[PDB]
Write a protein that binds this ligand. Structure first.
Ligand code: NNR
Length: 359
């Protein structure tokens, strides 16, 4: 009984890559004028949304979540694959459309209104109203501002962040990850970089884990490393998904960093046993900028020594995963300080404005 109730039904179309407040204002007006609204997400393989990593199936799921607390609003999918390109696609297209209306509606003798943004769709739809006992009307709505907003969001999400629907925000987020040995100032750097622009940041999970479970670096076993992989990943996703996210988040280490420690300190067998979880987790990471603190002259007591060992292995692995074009090495102390170098790198890779201190 997950069908739309009522007699006056509005049909609202979009690709929704992403959904934004322009859509939402129109939808809620439409829902105030009708007994219920059917949102139609249209798409096809390798369409505009698919090309930026938002294929039809994902936009449909995101919309369902976005409208998960609405009485009279249903979300449905119009799959446009395998259509004859010319005229005979219009018949089949409409068939699928009216099938969607039939399946997702409770009652009969409806009064249905299509909200349509292109003159071609209106004319083709008006010729193909079926004799199903419903009354149909097509209403032209101006979509120019909505389409332009969508285009501007895709070009520069950080400039239009507050208008992006929250379910879509993770996809468009910029992500800066800091990497380095223990006791090199990562945590101080992360917090200063993030606080400089009101961005959220994560903490190094390994430090929390060793305090909560009260164990030293040299007591870590294979299973601790596994828990640090998922623990750091969850902490990082939490910040990317945080409502405090304004478009840029800072991460204090990641699975690659943990993979460097594992490679250096675990027995070969135990490392090889963690490799699938490493690969899975590293594959789920999205990084735009990787800041590496190189070795120059609560404490991780064993992780302190052999900094150059850690750094060489880290650089090997960043090459192994093809990340070198996102890596900036903070070899200062040219810029005044490590912090000057990093905040400038943040500027170049995210677009955010940074104030000067001096003339
Ligand atoms: N670097 C990260 O840990 C990171 C960055 C962006 C997103 N995520 C998570 O992965 C998923 C997307 O693949 C999202 O659900 C994020 O939580 C993790």
């Amino acid at each position: 009984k997950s069908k739309l109730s009522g007699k006056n039904i509005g049909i609202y179309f979009g690709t929704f890559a992403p959904l934004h407040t322009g859509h939402q204002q129109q939808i809620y007006k439409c829902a105030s004028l009708n007994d219920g609204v059917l949102l139609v997400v249209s798409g096809y393989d390798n369409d505009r949304g698919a090309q930026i990593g938002l294929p039809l199936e994902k936009r449909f799921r995101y919309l369902r979540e976005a409208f998960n607390d609405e009485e009279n609003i249903k979300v449905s999918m119009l799959n446009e694959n395998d259509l004859p390109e010319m005229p005979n696609g219009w018949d089949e297209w409409a068939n699928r459309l009216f099938e969607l209306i039939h399946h997702n509606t409770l009652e009969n003798d409806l009064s249905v209104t299509f909200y349509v943004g292109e003159l071609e769709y209106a004319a083709e739809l008006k010729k193909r109203f079926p004799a199903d006992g419903n009354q149909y009307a097509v209403e032209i709505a101006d979509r120019h501002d909505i389409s332009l907003s969508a285009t501007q969001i895709r070009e520069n999400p950080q400039e239009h962040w507050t208008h992006i629907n929250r379910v879509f925000r993770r996809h468009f987020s910029k992500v800066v990850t800091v990497m380095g040995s223990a006791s090199t100032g990562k945590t101080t750097l992360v917090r200063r970089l993030a606080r400089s622009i009101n961005a959220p940041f994560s903490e190094e999970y390994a430090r929390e884990y060793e305090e909560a479970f009260n164990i030293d670096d040299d007591e870590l076993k294979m299973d601790d490393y596994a828990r640090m992989i998922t623990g750091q990943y969850d902490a990082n996703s939490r910040e990317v998904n945080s409502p405090a996210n304004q478009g840029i988040v800072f991460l204090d280490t990641d699975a690659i960093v943990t993979r460097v420690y594992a490679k250096l300190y675990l027995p070969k067998e135990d490392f090889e046993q963690l490799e699938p979880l490493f690969r899975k987790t590293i594959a789920d990471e999205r990084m735009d900028l990787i800041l590496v603190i190189p070795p120059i002259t609560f404490r991780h007591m064993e992780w302190e020594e052999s900094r150059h060992e850690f750094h060489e292995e880290l650089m090997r692995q960043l090459a192994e995963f093809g990340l070198l074009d996102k890596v900036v090495i903070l070899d200062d102390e040219g810029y005044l300080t490590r912090y000057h170098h990093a905040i400038d790198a943040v500027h170049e890779y995210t677009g955010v404005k940074i104030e000067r201190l001096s003339y």
